Subunit: 346 residues, 3 copies
């Protein structure tokens, strides 16, 4: 098993290590584990695109508990479980208070973990996902919470980037990836998580935003500390812009965020913050030829429909890659054992 | 090898043609495809009634999107997928506005169609099912929308009729089927769709309604056009009544509708019907059919609803199968 | 097929339970109870040893839950899926929004044509029985307003039998004493389990504040069942208003302020006593008790998986049985 032909993956070793691991935070995934996730994700991508048998994890029964609507993420996880050949029981159309009708989170997860092999949990509360992990006799995969931990989104973001720029994994002082993060960097927690993961590599960051909505100082400190630890930190590691023409120059990746109207004082202030960072074929003319455009979605008015036709757009491939990354992570964690012959390989 | 009474079906040829077909409208189903659906539905009926293995389509993962409550239709489709041996993820509980949350229907179906083999979609909006079809990389089956397109309801209605009156398939000038449609023919879109399908055959229509709720003119025009194509149109092809006594006389089929006093069916109103007449109702019923009729052997509305399982299994099998053998098809 | 000493003709008992609806614990007789306990135990050992649990694939069920009861519904879903079968779910509705004008008889006549069996939870008394009349397929009652909840009684009994397997012997010398604590008027889980336990050599302490005592007709049923097997005495049924007296010399404490259980209130219980609670709990049992080896309420909830798998297996199987 090789990825990029450079890095050998002992999937047998790495699975023994990941068996029954809970994944709450992207920091719960180390270098070896990231390689295993990326290799295994790529096998599921090729197997599914070639219409082959995807049933690499068959006899498992999961519970998916989504205590806020997040239909795209929930469907992606359901699809991953079912495509692997396993089964799932769903709790949706509930919130925290109506699901825990008086009962403690500890009691609920202690009991529910006796019924199933694994739990997928989405809850806007941060307190609750951690209480669930303490109480559960079974592995939990966080599908998103209030603190902005959403490891599967970070992992699929990274998988998408590595497919176009596989050199991010090399940690080569000569092969540096430049990414612009555009829009609401205060509230776009998907930026916070992916920045933490990218800062483990030779990466330079453009933060493109307007005053009130800049990247928070704690994320810059984390980026800085991770770049210093691998000797990739310089005066040029982190640049700040308030406009696209400067921000989008000489970047391999443009990652747009959701700009929600609820985040401004009125609709005036919101329509002037869209319009400024709205992406068009015009704003993309003086980007690199190899630039790829990501967006965690849903896209509303941040990227004009005309860009969908532009070969630099990959936000829909990004969403799709979520299926392959969620299948990979479930396979590595919930497999009973491994043997050589049993792993996915196309 | 594949015969429907005495018409031979090249299920292999017909499936090559239906593979990854979307089915939005009963007009998306042609003669050969209708035969394949009827043959295949009948196999699933016999297989399930004899408790044999029904798993003719394993390895598929579907998404079912119901953006209005239609629990009977949703459960029917779920049951069909699961009985075929495939798996499904469900989006229910919701309406158009709460599901799209101001994301476009095109983006939502572009993404969702990357996750699954096929989508079952019910939405009161007519715009939405068509946008979904243009955006989806995967086949869509319309389970009902606002324009009254509901192809699986037409198909199961037709399957039910063909089981009692298999001569409707012959297009023989001497073997004419007479159907009375009773109740709200203006708003009963199930009548509109089935009329379109029935008018492809040697069929005569009684439209039994009050003035305000008659069959609409464009449906009469479509019936007339379809009857003329096969030279089955006459001055006697389409009669209009406002009362059951006259309406229900010499009709092989009585198809009742929800009338949301005059058009209530009872064992009394059934005395001057043919011996062989069968009674359909798309369901749910309120007062249109008195509970006493359930005991009358002419009632088949519950067998009708049951046949929905076998027709939805057939249609999923014919569209989503990725076999390459005649030997692999259902053949009990 | 033995439970250490009773031989089970699982073949004969399944021929009898095939396509049986289970509404009320009285729908389960002695032989059927043995089959459910034997089969439950096989699924317990199979799952704890991570072996293949797929003893019933090829079935498709419908689960209809017309009140929120996420614990019970998930337990049933888990049981169906672990067995290898499939389920279609109708939830997050109530009786009025699900029927929307349509009769219960029409809805179950139709829905029973789609599936091999139905799991039905409805706070209505009348509806589960109408569903049973109308359905062409077996119904398992997952709980209704009349307080019928057979699977809870069965898993309660399974839990007790695991610690005190002598309840099955009907030996005049091997008597089980159970204290029922809290709201015995409204705690219908007490009503059902009392009816089942009274079929055996069992003595009952009813621990309650006056306003919430065990109802007279349940004491009459207990008395009738004890008399039929010649286990009735002046000591068969005691009443207390306090834990000190109630919890003395009882093998089982079943919970549902004076009646808050703590490590303190458990000091002068027998060494072998086990503590049940159908759950969810609020204050009735302090978190400190969870550490006390007498607590089994979480093992109890767990056993619901194995009992619901057993019951579905014995009813829906078309017979190779689970063993070891
Ligand atoms: N209103 O829903 C009634 C129903 C649901 C499912 C199947 C049959 C009937
Ligand atoms: N309050 O939710 C408690 C619960 C426990 C186990 C399974 C589902 C729900
Ligand atoms: Na499901």
């Amino acid at each position: 098993f090789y990825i990029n032909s450079k890095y050998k993956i002992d999937l047998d070793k790495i699975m023994t290590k990941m068996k029954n691991k809970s994944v709450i935070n992207i920091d719960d995934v180390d270098d070896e584990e990231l390689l295993a996730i990326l290799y295994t994700s790529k096998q599921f991508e090729k197997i599914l695109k070639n219409n082959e048998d995807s049933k690499y994890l068959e006899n498992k029964v999961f519970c998916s508990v989504f205590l806020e609507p997040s239909t795209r993420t929930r469907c992606s996880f359901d699809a991953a479980i079912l495509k692997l050949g396993s089964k799932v029981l769903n709790i949706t159309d509930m919130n925290s208070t109506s699901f825990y009708k008086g009962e403690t989170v500890e009691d609920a997860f202690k009991i529910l973990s006796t019924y199933v092999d694994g739990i997928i949990y989405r809850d806007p509360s941060k307190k609750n996902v951690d209480i669930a992990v303490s109480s559960s006799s079974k592995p939990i995969i966080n599908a998103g919470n209030g603190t902005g931990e959403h490891p599967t989104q970070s992992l699929l973001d990274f998988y998408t980037i590595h497919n176009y720029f596989p050199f991010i994994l090399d940690r080569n002082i000569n092969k540096k990836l430049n990414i612009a993060f555009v829009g609401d960097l205060k509230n776009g927690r998907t930026v916070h998580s992916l920045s933490k993961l990218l800062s483990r590599y030779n990466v330079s960051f453009n933060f493109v935003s307007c005053k009130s909505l800049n990247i928070p100082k704690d994320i810059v400190n984390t980026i800085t500390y991770n770049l210093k630890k691998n000797n990739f930190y310089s005066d040029d590691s982190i640049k700040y812009f308030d406009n696209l023409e400067e921000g989008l120059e000489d970047v391999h990746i443009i990652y747009m965020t959701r700009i929600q109207k609820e985040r401004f004082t009125d609709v005036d202030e919101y329509n002037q913050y869209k319009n400024a960072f709205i992406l068009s074929n015009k704003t993309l003319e003086n980007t690199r030829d190899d630039t790829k455009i990501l967006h965690p979605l849903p896209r509303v008015n941040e990227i004009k429909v005309e860009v969908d036709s532009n070969p630099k757009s990959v936000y829909f491939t990004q969403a799709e890659n979520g299926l392959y990354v969620r299948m990979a992570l479930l396979y590595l964690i919930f497999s009973s054992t491994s043997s050589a012959w049993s792993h996915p390989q196309f």
